[PDB]
Amino acid sequence: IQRTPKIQVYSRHPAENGKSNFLNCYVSGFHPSDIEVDLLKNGERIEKVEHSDLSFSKDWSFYLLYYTEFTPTEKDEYACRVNHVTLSQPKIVKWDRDM
Amino acid sequence: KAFSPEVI
Amino acid sequence: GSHSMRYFYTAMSRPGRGEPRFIAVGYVDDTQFVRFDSDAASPRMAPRAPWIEQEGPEYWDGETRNMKASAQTYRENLRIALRYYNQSEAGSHIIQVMYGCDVGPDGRLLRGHNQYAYDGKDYIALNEDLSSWTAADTAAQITQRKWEAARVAEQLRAYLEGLCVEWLRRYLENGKETLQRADPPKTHVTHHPISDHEATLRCWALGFYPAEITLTWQRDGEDQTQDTELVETRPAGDRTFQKWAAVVVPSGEEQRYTCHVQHEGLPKPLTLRW
DSSP states (O other), X not given: OOBOOEEEEEESSOOOTTXXXXXXXXXXXXXXXXXXXXXXXXXXXXXXXEEOOOEEOTTSOEEEEXXXXXXXXXXXXXXXXXEOTTOSSOEEEEOOTTO | XXXXXXXX | OOEEEEEEEEEEOOTTSOSOEEEEXXXXXXXXXXXXXXXXXXXXXXXOSGGGTTSOHHXXXXXXXXXXXXXXXXXXXXXXXXXXXXXXXXXXXXXXEEEEEEEOTTSOEEEEEEEEEETTXXXXXXXXXXXXXXXXXXXXXXXXXXXXXXXXXXXXHHHHHTHHHXXXXXXXXXXXXXXXXXXOOEEEEEEEEOSSSEEEEEXXXXXXXXXXXXXXXXXXXXXXXXXXXXXXXXXXXXXXXXXXXXXXXXXXXXXXXXXXXXXTTOSSOEEEOO
């Protein structure tokens, strides 16, 4: 039985409007390994997104870090969009500056 | 430094 | 366990989409230092930390030839597993391996590791004696018989006690400013009302290395294990990690709660409050 991804959306450094930072989406706990992840700015796909090399935890479930440079503001909205064979449609998680 | 592979 | 070295392999079949993908990564503790991907435009063993960069052409070519040979071997093991489980050539499947050594403060072997999974479930593991095997099912008992007949445990044991430990001690010396440096957590408590009658207290740890940490909430000195929400420890992207722990508290009672933080980088455990 296949395993669905946990998703956390967060910044490298505490957020400060107008200061450069990194927006992270960490996906973990999933099996098998193929996974689709997008970072979004006001609903729209960010082009330049990097990820870490495929690794796995002691329970065999995979993890990856997707990340991009960003400068947060009061009104810009950021989110991570994830699809996996275990999801009937893409899961969208909004960035919350306090989590 | 890695080890060599094994056939199951 | 003062330090560890670990290699992780994932081999994944994909019928109709070419040969199975093989990917390898190596770690010292929570620091990745090498990567191989048979899907790269030109696959080689490639550096992922600055302290491995100084190894010469003999190292990188030796590691490259082994990764190439391993990709072929794990492709065969994928073919063998189908006959072990009565499966067809049309479905996609995954083999994973983890292996390596833990050393104490004086560099001696504390313990050796070598386990396999198939489709994310335990398959076979070398026992702590580095001589005998635990198979999870009747398929892995076939492999066990094969490995007993070829004296495979002996070969691993020579590696785990020899080269594994020797190279680990080399990497710890070359990477000592980072590998032998713990970064303690920066900690604070935040407070977020949810109604007139309740509020969340969140205890934060930021900027720490290595990953291992304990965060716990006490109400009136008693651990609140069933009532605390803990997120998975997560990477920040600059080598350090992040984690929080949250509790929901009656308004007016916030001072009855204390957060407790334990980490290798702290001289002693920390107690915080809002």
